[PDB]
Amino acid sequence: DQICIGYHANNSTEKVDTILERNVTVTHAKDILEKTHNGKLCKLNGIPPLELGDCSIAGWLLGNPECDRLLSVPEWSYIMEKENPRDGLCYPGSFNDYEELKHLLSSVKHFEKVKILPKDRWTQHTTTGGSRACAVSGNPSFFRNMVWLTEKGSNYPVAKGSYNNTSGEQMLIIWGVHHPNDETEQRTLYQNVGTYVSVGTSTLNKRSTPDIATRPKVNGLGSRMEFSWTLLDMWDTINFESTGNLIAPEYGFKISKRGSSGIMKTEGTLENCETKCQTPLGAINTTLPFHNVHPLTIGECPKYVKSEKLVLATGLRNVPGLFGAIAGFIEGGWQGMIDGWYGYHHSNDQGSGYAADKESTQKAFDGITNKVNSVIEKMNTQFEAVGKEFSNLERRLENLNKKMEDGFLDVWTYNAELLVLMENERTLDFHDSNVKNLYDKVRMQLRDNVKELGNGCFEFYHKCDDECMNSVKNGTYDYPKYEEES
Amino acid sequence: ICIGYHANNSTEKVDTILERNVTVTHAKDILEKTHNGKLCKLNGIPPLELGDCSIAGWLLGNPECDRLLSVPEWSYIMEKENPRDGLCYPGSFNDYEELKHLLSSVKHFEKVKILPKDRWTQHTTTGGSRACAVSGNPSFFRNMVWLTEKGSNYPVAKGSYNNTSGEQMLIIWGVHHPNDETEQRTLYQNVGTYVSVGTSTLNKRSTPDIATRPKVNGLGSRMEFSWTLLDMWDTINFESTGNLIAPEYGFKISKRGSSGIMKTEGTLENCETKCQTPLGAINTTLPFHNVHPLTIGECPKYVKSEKLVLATGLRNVPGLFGAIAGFIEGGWQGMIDGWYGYAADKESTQKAFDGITNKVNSVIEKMNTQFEAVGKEFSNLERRLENLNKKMEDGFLDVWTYNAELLVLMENERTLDFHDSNVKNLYDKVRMQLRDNVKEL
Amino acid sequence: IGYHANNSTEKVDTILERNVTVTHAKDILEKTHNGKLCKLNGIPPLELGDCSIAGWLLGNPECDRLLSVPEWSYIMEKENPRDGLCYPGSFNDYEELKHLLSSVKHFEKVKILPKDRWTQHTTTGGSRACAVSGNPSFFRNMVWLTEKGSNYPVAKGSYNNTSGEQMLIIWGVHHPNDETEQRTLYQNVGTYVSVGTSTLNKRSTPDIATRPKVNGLGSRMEFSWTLLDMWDTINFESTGNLIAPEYGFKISKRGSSGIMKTEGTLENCETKCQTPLGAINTTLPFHNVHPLTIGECPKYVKSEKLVLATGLRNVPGLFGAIAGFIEGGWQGMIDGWYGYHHSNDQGSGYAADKESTQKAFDGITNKVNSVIEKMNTQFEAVGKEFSNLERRLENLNKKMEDGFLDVWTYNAELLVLMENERTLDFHDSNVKNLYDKVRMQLRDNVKELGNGCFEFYHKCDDECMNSVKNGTYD
Ligand SMILES: CC(=O)N[C@H]1[C@H]([C@H](O)[C@H](O)CO)O[C@@](O)(C(=O)O)C[C@@H]1O
């Protein structure tokens, strides 16, 4: 008669690494590194992204005619722009503090255009000036949202125009100053020569004089338009005053935020799925602590890491350690045991059998669960934008960001790598111990009444029927008997 | 003879990688969460208290900022969120954030008269404004001087100052932007005016901007202040045909190091600290805290946790080695001398208490801690710079939290196992001696 | 059953103890340099000597002794360079320029507005502030357009960039001390300097005012720069006060490095990691040589030692074998970490257990290797450049650099500590398992002494012994 102590072993080929070994085969394993996406650009926490198509934020805001096909939502959560957008400043020039503007617009709670200096009211000034650089149908046109004030009659009276912001939200307002190619152009557009463009608020005070000079031709244009912007507060007013060269707004933009997102560079288009974490390659949907999909994410994302696999062993070493039981003094595992991780055999005259030890396999499965769950749910995860915008005179600011983004990459990678490695030698040892303790718990009961074979089995001197066996696995067994002895 | 382990009446719970809600005999918390609700001196030196004033209001001499204490040496700055008294006269202050950063912590700071008001003969020196009113009557930033037309003549205003006070000197100046060409004339006569400021390093020329504006404090005009740091033995040259708001005083400034501005409603209180938060002052040897993210001084790592508890004693039983709560079913309340015993085993309880000591001490004293400001200042055209700081401050938050959480968790399954082993080794040390002469129950 | 013990005095620390002596140990903290400034990944650094980037580019006469490579990987500048703007003034967006020039793939000067062609303008103006041999001179690379005859015609000059690479171009605007100087240099008074490209549009008027004298000069020169694109043109136009370029700079990059402040000179050695104290050459994960590095460097940490135990506790734990129920180690055993003794009537002996010492040495190898080769390492510059109106940007960088210092230090410290209590326990276990593997075989036929030895009842000749170490025996 006999009773044995053994551990599970299936047909798995899953490999994990531990601090001390590598290519170690285990019965079951969990991967905690997310690497898959749904190849779609999506709504972020339920709200869509502003799709710009081929347009740039500047082109959109200014009303480039080439940007008319734009959807124009009231509320968006990030911005889809392209790398190198085709239609921006149709009329050559520049946009002051442009990055900051995009950062602002990167995520809006409510955003609505409103007419604030209607085109008609500029009597005493020519209002219809366009340019073939903004051509709609071969004919000269102009940024829809703006107005090109030029000489009327042969007289450019001091252009004055203000606007009290009453729409009950902060208002974004953009304006411009035109830089002619030559003093003639300046005159045949404005009459005056010593001109200036003056913009003021409770907070702003900016005066600009135009720069008349020859320049390389852009879209056949040597002249330039320099746009600036401010955020007109609630109940505050904005005062325009100019003797020429002002490109004034027709429209404002009520804007309410909310929070702050970022601009996502991509060729793709919105697609009507959901996500809490969007990449330029697609959307991530995971509970996992780490991923390697793409560094430029937006939303609540896992830690981006430079790894290809991060695998936790969860089951035991598959054997077709610290305590020397598994693949130790117990040479191999039993495919025959299916109920659980560890258990017994017993060879009787009533029949042979396998039977997992419920209590020990339970206490273990629960533990390994806490482990995996711990590695996963202790990870703090907030909402970030990552991808960022910097000008050409900001290569250092940009590089400071990169030094920082890299720093965290290195830190998270080294940790997640070693976390898996260290936690894995522990897990195996854990299983090994459990078995070794299960072995010892029987050896200590049986004591004198069994030969200790050494393969992890015990050969009973006395006969040990089913009931008896069950007492050995019970915790009963005793012992008085004695027998033998004889 | 018996082999057993200690077990008191504790209810203290810790978590381990493998289990949670585990009860241990004794435990240490390494997360600091308490403050003394006071704003305090930092490393012995006080903070500049601004009260309702803004740094700008203070420096320019807003009349509303006269009640200010004005120490010679401070270690941080107490400002409010939305200070009532700043630029009484509407306008702006160039490179303001940078200035605040500079002034955030001074080793020595002392006002000195450098272009005395009197000496501006040939210029009217007494101009004020009801926007800076003291007692219904028009007044003006005390530290500044409003040069205006005298007689009906504004001669080229010239004034220089050689810095001899043997310290770097902060100097602030201004350019007035009138509401209309009339105001400009009835203040300065001239129309094509400019304000010129120069040093060995500085060269700035400004023309005033005459334009209509929204009224602020009933004022459409504006004042635009700029500043420089005049070096030792260097000179500053003012020159102007109008619209210059020149300084009467400079500020000798020596630093030292660098602190930061702390936003708070509260007032200084005469306690000490090496670590100040807006909620109060922290006093701890602990490696982590969650008091408030905006700290100044030598602080523990700010972490997003509520508890971080190290088990130190053993599992309380009223593991890897299967002794504790294992083949030895329970603990003895009867044993009081130490952790394990038969009468506690002095040598084994000692070697263990020493070990668990090294553990806790190691977790605590390996933490590198330097002096930082955290809270920071950024303008409106700096929302990105600001956001870059937040992405970074968050990044570290996530890193430290994830680590401290798991550190506690991992180090706790180890500690218990440690105890378990010690017992099991104590048991084996006896079983191996006794051998043949005892029944092994 | 016993374990190895040599004559080592090497000490490591563990979570639970300190000053623990082990048989063998590995240090993973690099602290040594070769005291040389070196080529970085095969390419040399631009050596500036006493010159500043500005002095170099503008052609300060004092900067003629410069080597001038076509391709460099970092820049050697000094803290407080003697020769920069010989003529007092300033340089707009200077930091950014240095950052750009910090590392070039190809860099070559080319004449783009030859001095001669400025007829109708005096081209020979110098200054004793840029004196070569007591005589007035001027930035070699620049040209001081001044009145010719008594007439300063509108100065015009353009240049189409055809050299097939981005071109750096620097220009200047002169700020006279007084309206007289302005006239006796340019005739005109309402002057302006105008510079344009497809992207640039800058107009500057000179500032005439009195100033503290620098190099006996109250006047000032204010230089600005742009990056003229391929096939783009740059248009100068000026009625006075323009200090125009004679030369451009073809520039191609590549990547991005940084400026290294040092007194020393290039030396013809190699490195992938350069510090201001010398060059690092290591596979180690951490170092404490100096924080301002350039290249692929280990993590800079605030430690003095970071030592992994690798061999076992030297005894002249969790499992209670080493320094436990087996009181000491055997100097007699040399073959490996653990093994047996056996006292026979054919002779005594020592003999390490090959299979167990192997499996262990392999493991401890994976450990060290793992700590070392999982460390992600990229190329960075660290040291950085910020102006005086950037004390915040600078401080933001310091808060960040510190942040990582604290993080890496706390981790490497604890990594070593934790991994070391594990390593010792590991050895302890291996022994204890070796002991149990024999006890389980021998069973009934031996008295179990208790010192880690077994006394055979039956006689156990050589063959027999070998069966005990075999795995046979029966
Ligand atoms: C006139 C000219 O082109 N260069 C002359 C300058 C300039 O007049 C002033 O530096 C500009 O204000 O004056 C010098 O005395 C000088 O600087 O050494 C001599 C030099 O030949």
Short mmCIF file of N, CA and C in Angstrom, two decimals, chain C residues 69-180:
data_model
loop_
_atom_site.label_atom_id
_atom_site.label_comp_id
_atom_site.label_asym_id
_atom_site.label_seq_id
_atom_site.Cartn_x
_atom_site.Cartn_y
_atom_site.Cartn_z
N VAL C 69 37.06 71.53 -38.24
CA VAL C 69 36.69 70.27 -38.85
C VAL C 69 35.43 70.42 -39.69
N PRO C 70 35.18 69.46 -40.59
CA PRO C 70 33.97 69.46 -41.41
C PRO C 70 32.81 68.78 -40.69
N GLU C 71 33.13 67.91 -39.74
CA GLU C 71 32.11 67.13 -39.06
C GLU C 71 32.55 66.93 -37.63
N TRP C 72 31.71 67.33 -36.68
CA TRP C 72 31.98 67.08 -35.26
C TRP C 72 30.76 66.50 -34.54
N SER C 73 31.00 65.95 -33.35
CA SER C 73 30.00 65.18 -32.60
C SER C 73 29.56 65.86 -31.29
N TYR C 74 30.44 66.65 -30.70
CA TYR C 74 30.05 67.57 -29.63
C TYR C 74 30.88 68.86 -29.72
N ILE C 75 30.73 69.77 -28.77
CA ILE C 75 31.52 71.00 -28.80
C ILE C 75 32.26 71.23 -27.49
N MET C 76 33.57 71.41 -27.58
CA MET C 76 34.37 71.83 -26.44
C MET C 76 34.47 73.35 -26.33
N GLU C 77 33.80 73.91 -25.33
CA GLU C 77 33.85 75.34 -25.10
C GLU C 77 34.42 75.46 -23.71
N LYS C 78 34.75 76.68 -23.30
CA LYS C 78 35.19 76.89 -21.93
C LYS C 78 34.10 77.55 -21.08
N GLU C 79 34.26 77.48 -19.77
CA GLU C 79 33.44 78.29 -18.89
C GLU C 79 34.06 79.67 -18.91
N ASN C 80 33.36 80.63 -19.51
CA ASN C 80 33.88 82.00 -19.64
C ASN C 80 35.02 82.10 -20.65
N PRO C 81 34.68 82.00 -21.94
CA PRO C 81 35.62 82.09 -23.05
C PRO C 81 36.13 83.51 -23.23
N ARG C 82 37.44 83.64 -23.43
CA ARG C 82 38.09 84.94 -23.52
C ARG C 82 37.66 85.76 -24.74
N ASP C 83 37.48 85.10 -25.88
CA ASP C 83 37.23 85.82 -27.12
C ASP C 83 35.89 85.48 -27.73
N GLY C 84 34.94 86.39 -27.57
CA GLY C 84 33.65 86.25 -28.20
C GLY C 84 33.38 87.46 -29.07
N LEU C 85 32.41 88.27 -28.66
CA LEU C 85 32.11 89.47 -29.41
C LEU C 85 33.14 90.53 -29.09
N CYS C 86 34.24 90.55 -29.85
CA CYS C 86 35.28 91.55 -29.65
C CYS C 86 34.63 92.94 -29.61
N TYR C 87 33.76 93.20 -30.58
CA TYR C 87 32.94 94.41 -30.58
C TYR C 87 31.70 94.19 -29.69
N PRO C 88 31.51 95.05 -28.67
CA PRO C 88 30.45 94.81 -27.68
C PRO C 88 29.08 94.71 -28.34
N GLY C 89 28.19 93.93 -27.74
CA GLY C 89 26.85 93.79 -28.27
C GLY C 89 26.18 92.53 -27.79
N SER C 90 25.46 91.88 -28.69
CA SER C 90 24.64 90.74 -28.31
C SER C 90 24.32 89.87 -29.51
N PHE C 91 23.77 88.70 -29.22
CA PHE C 91 23.48 87.71 -30.24
C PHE C 91 22.09 87.12 -29.95
N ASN C 92 21.12 87.39 -30.81
CA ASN C 92 19.76 86.93 -30.57
C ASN C 92 19.61 85.43 -30.71
N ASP C 93 18.76 84.84 -29.86
CA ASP C 93 18.53 83.41 -29.92
C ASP C 93 19.85 82.68 -29.94
N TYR C 94 20.76 83.08 -29.08
CA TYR C 94 22.09 82.51 -29.11
C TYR C 94 22.11 81.04 -28.66
N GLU C 95 21.48 80.74 -27.53
CA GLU C 95 21.42 79.38 -27.02
C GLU C 95 20.98 78.39 -28.09
N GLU C 96 19.81 78.64 -28.65
CA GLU C 96 19.30 77.84 -29.75
C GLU C 96 20.34 77.59 -30.84
N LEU C 97 21.06 78.63 -31.25
CA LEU C 97 22.14 78.46 -32.22
C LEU C 97 23.17 77.44 -31.74
N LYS C 98 23.67 77.59 -30.52
CA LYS C 98 24.66 76.65 -29.98
C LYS C 98 24.12 75.23 -29.98
N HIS C 99 22.85 75.08 -29.60
CA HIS C 99 22.20 73.77 -29.60
C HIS C 99 22.22 73.19 -31.00
N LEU C 100 21.91 74.02 -32.00
CA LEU C 100 21.95 73.59 -33.39
C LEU C 100 23.34 73.12 -33.79
N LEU C 101 24.35 73.94 -33.48
CA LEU C 101 25.71 73.69 -33.90
C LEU C 101 26.39 72.65 -33.03
N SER C 102 25.70 72.18 -31.99
CA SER C 102 26.32 71.27 -31.03
C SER C 102 26.81 69.98 -31.68
N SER C 103 26.30 69.67 -32.86
CA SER C 103 26.68 68.44 -33.53
C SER C 103 26.32 68.49 -35.00
N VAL C 104 27.33 68.43 -35.84
CA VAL C 104 27.11 68.59 -37.27
C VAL C 104 27.63 67.38 -38.06
N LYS C 105 26.88 66.98 -39.08
CA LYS C 105 27.30 65.91 -39.99
C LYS C 105 28.21 66.45 -41.10
N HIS C 106 27.88 67.63 -41.60
CA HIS C 106 28.75 68.34 -42.53
C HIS C 106 28.57 69.84 -42.35
N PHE C 107 29.68 70.58 -42.32
CA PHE C 107 29.66 72.00 -42.02
C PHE C 107 30.77 72.66 -42.80
N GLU C 108 30.41 73.58 -43.68
CA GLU C 108 31.38 74.16 -44.62
C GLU C 108 31.08 75.62 -44.98
N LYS C 109 32.06 76.49 -44.77
CA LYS C 109 31.89 77.92 -45.05
C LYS C 109 31.89 78.21 -46.55
N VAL C 110 30.99 79.08 -47.01
CA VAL C 110 30.97 79.48 -48.42
C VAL C 110 30.65 80.96 -48.63
N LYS C 111 31.44 81.63 -49.46
CA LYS C 111 31.25 83.06 -49.73
C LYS C 111 29.95 83.31 -50.50
N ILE C 112 29.08 84.17 -49.97
CA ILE C 112 27.75 84.37 -50.57
C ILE C 112 27.41 85.83 -50.91
N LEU C 113 28.11 86.77 -50.29
CA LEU C 113 28.00 88.18 -50.64
C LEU C 113 29.39 88.79 -50.64
N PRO C 114 30.20 88.47 -51.66
CA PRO C 114 31.61 88.86 -51.70
C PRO C 114 31.79 90.35 -51.39
N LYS C 115 32.80 90.65 -50.57
CA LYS C 115 33.07 92.00 -50.09
C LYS C 115 33.19 93.02 -51.21
N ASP C 116 33.87 92.63 -52.30
CA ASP C 116 34.15 93.51 -53.43
C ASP C 116 32.90 94.10 -54.05
N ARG C 117 31.87 93.28 -54.21
CA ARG C 117 30.69 93.67 -54.98
C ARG C 117 29.89 94.81 -54.35
N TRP C 118 30.17 95.13 -53.09
CA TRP C 118 29.52 96.26 -52.44
C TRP C 118 30.16 97.57 -52.90
N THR C 119 30.13 97.84 -54.20
CA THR C 119 30.56 99.15 -54.68
C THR C 119 29.56 100.14 -54.09
N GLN C 120 29.78 101.43 -54.30
CA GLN C 120 28.84 102.43 -53.77
C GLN C 120 28.64 102.34 -52.26
N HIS C 121 29.54 101.64 -51.58
CA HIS C 121 29.52 101.57 -50.13
C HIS C 121 30.93 101.31 -49.62
N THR C 122 31.31 101.98 -48.53
CA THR C 122 32.62 101.73 -47.93
C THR C 122 32.62 100.41 -47.17
N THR C 123 33.64 99.59 -47.43
CA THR C 123 33.60 98.19 -47.01
C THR C 123 34.71 97.84 -46.03
N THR C 124 35.53 98.83 -45.68
CA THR C 124 36.80 98.58 -45.02
C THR C 124 36.83 98.95 -43.54
N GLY C 125 35.69 99.40 -43.02
CA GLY C 125 35.59 99.81 -41.63
C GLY C 125 35.94 98.73 -40.63
N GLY C 126 36.79 99.08 -39.67
CA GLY C 126 37.15 98.18 -38.60
C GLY C 126 36.98 98.87 -37.26
N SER C 127 37.58 98.32 -36.21
CA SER C 127 37.55 98.93 -34.89
C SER C 127 38.68 98.41 -34.04
N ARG C 128 39.30 99.29 -33.26
CA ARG C 128 40.37 98.87 -32.37
C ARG C 128 39.88 97.91 -31.28
N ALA C 129 38.57 97.69 -31.23
CA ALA C 129 38.02 96.69 -30.33
C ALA C 129 38.21 95.30 -30.93
N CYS C 130 38.51 95.25 -32.22
CA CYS C 130 38.80 94.00 -32.91
C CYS C 130 40.19 94.08 -33.50
N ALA C 131 41.10 94.67 -32.74
CA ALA C 131 42.42 95.02 -33.26
C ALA C 131 43.33 93.83 -33.50
N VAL C 132 43.84 93.74 -34.73
CA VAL C 132 44.93 92.83 -35.04
C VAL C 132 46.20 93.63 -35.31
N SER C 133 47.12 93.61 -34.35
CA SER C 133 48.38 94.35 -34.45
C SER C 133 48.16 95.85 -34.24
N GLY C 134 47.50 96.21 -33.15
CA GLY C 134 47.27 97.60 -32.81
C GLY C 134 46.40 98.36 -33.79
N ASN C 135 46.23 97.80 -34.98
CA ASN C 135 45.41 98.42 -36.01
C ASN C 135 43.97 97.94 -35.97
N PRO C 136 43.03 98.83 -36.29
CA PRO C 136 41.60 98.50 -36.29
C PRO C 136 41.27 97.38 -37.27
N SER C 137 40.52 96.38 -36.81
CA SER C 137 40.07 95.30 -37.69
C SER C 137 38.62 94.93 -37.38
N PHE C 138 38.16 93.80 -37.90
CA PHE C 138 36.75 93.45 -37.79
C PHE C 138 36.51 91.96 -38.00
N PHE C 139 35.42 91.45 -37.44
CA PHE C 139 34.99 90.07 -37.65
C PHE C 139 35.25 89.70 -39.10
N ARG C 140 36.11 88.72 -39.33
CA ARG C 140 36.51 88.35 -40.68
C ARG C 140 35.32 87.96 -41.54
N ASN C 141 34.38 87.23 -40.95
CA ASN C 141 33.27 86.68 -41.71
C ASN C 141 32.18 87.69 -42.05
N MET C 142 32.26 88.88 -41.46
CA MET C 142 31.25 89.91 -41.64
C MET C 142 31.79 91.12 -42.40
N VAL C 143 30.91 92.05 -42.77
CA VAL C 143 31.31 93.24 -43.51
C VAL C 143 30.57 94.47 -43.02
N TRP C 144 31.32 95.52 -42.69
CA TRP C 144 30.73 96.74 -42.13
C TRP C 144 30.42 97.79 -43.19
N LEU C 145 29.25 97.70 -43.80
CA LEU C 145 28.84 98.70 -44.78
C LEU C 145 28.70 100.08 -44.16
N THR C 146 29.46 101.05 -44.68
CA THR C 146 29.37 102.45 -44.26
C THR C 146 29.34 103.41 -45.44
N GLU C 147 29.04 104.68 -45.16
CA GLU C 147 28.93 105.70 -46.21
C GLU C 147 30.16 105.75 -47.12
N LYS C 148 29.92 105.82 -48.43
CA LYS C 148 30.98 106.02 -49.42
C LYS C 148 30.75 107.30 -50.23
N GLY C 149 31.82 108.05 -50.45
CA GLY C 149 31.70 109.43 -50.90
C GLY C 149 31.17 110.18 -49.69
N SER C 150 29.97 110.73 -49.82
CA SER C 150 29.21 111.19 -48.66
C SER C 150 27.75 110.82 -48.90
N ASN C 151 27.57 109.56 -49.26
CA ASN C 151 26.33 109.06 -49.80
C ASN C 151 26.20 107.59 -49.41
N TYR C 152 25.07 107.23 -48.79
CA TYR C 152 24.78 105.84 -48.46
C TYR C 152 23.54 105.41 -49.23
N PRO C 153 23.73 104.94 -50.46
CA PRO C 153 22.60 104.52 -51.28
C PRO C 153 21.93 103.34 -50.62
N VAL C 154 20.65 103.15 -50.87
CA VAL C 154 19.95 101.99 -50.34
C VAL C 154 20.77 100.73 -50.61
N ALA C 155 21.30 100.12 -49.57
CA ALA C 155 22.11 98.92 -49.72
C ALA C 155 21.23 97.71 -49.97
N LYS C 156 21.38 97.08 -51.13
CA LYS C 156 20.62 95.88 -51.43
C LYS C 156 21.55 94.73 -51.75
N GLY C 157 21.20 93.53 -51.30
CA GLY C 157 21.99 92.36 -51.57
C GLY C 157 21.19 91.11 -51.27
N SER C 158 21.14 90.19 -52.22
CA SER C 158 20.43 88.95 -51.97
C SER C 158 21.33 87.75 -52.24
N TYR C 159 20.86 86.56 -51.90
CA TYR C 159 21.61 85.33 -52.17
C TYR C 159 20.70 84.11 -52.26
N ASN C 160 20.67 83.49 -53.43
CA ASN C 160 19.90 82.26 -53.62
C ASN C 160 20.76 81.08 -53.17
N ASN C 161 20.25 80.32 -52.19
CA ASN C 161 21.00 79.19 -51.65
C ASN C 161 20.94 77.97 -52.55
N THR C 162 22.05 77.70 -53.23
CA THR C 162 22.10 76.64 -54.21
C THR C 162 23.04 75.51 -53.79
N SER C 163 23.80 75.74 -52.72
CA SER C 163 24.80 74.79 -52.25
C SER C 163 24.22 73.45 -51.82
N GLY C 164 22.93 73.26 -52.05
CA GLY C 164 22.28 71.98 -51.81
C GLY C 164 22.21 71.52 -50.36
N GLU C 165 22.44 72.43 -49.43
CA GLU C 165 22.24 72.14 -48.02
C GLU C 165 21.67 73.36 -47.33
N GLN C 166 20.93 73.16 -46.24
CA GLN C 166 20.50 74.27 -45.40
C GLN C 166 21.70 75.17 -45.14
N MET C 167 21.49 76.48 -45.16
CA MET C 167 22.59 77.38 -44.85
C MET C 167 22.33 78.34 -43.68
N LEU C 168 23.20 78.27 -42.68
CA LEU C 168 23.18 79.20 -41.57
C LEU C 168 23.72 80.54 -42.04
N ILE C 169 22.99 81.62 -41.78
CA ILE C 169 23.44 82.96 -42.16
C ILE C 169 23.27 83.97 -41.01
N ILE C 170 24.34 84.68 -40.66
CA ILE C 170 24.30 85.62 -39.54
C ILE C 170 24.39 87.05 -40.04
N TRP C 171 23.65 87.97 -39.43
CA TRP C 171 23.77 89.39 -39.78
C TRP C 171 23.74 90.30 -38.55
N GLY C 172 23.87 91.60 -38.74
CA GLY C 172 24.01 92.49 -37.61
C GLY C 172 23.47 93.90 -37.80
N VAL C 173 23.17 94.56 -36.69
CA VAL C 173 22.70 95.93 -36.72
C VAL C 173 23.48 96.72 -35.69
N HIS C 174 24.06 97.83 -36.14
CA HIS C 174 24.97 98.62 -35.33
C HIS C 174 24.24 99.72 -34.57
N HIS C 175 24.47 99.78 -33.26
CA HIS C 175 23.84 100.80 -32.43
C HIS C 175 24.87 101.83 -31.96
N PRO C 176 24.95 102.99 -32.65
CA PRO C 176 25.89 104.08 -32.39
C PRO C 176 25.68 104.75 -31.03
N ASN C 177 26.73 105.41 -30.54
CA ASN C 177 26.69 106.07 -29.23
C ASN C 177 25.99 107.42 -29.26
N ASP C 178 25.95 108.05 -30.43
CA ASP C 178 25.38 109.39 -30.57
C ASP C 178 25.05 109.71 -32.03
N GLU C 179 24.11 110.63 -32.23
CA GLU C 179 23.62 110.94 -33.56
C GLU C 179 24.72 111.37 -34.52
N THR C 180 25.82 111.90 -33.98
CA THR C 180 26.94 112.31 -34.81
C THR C 180 27.60 111.09 -35.45
#
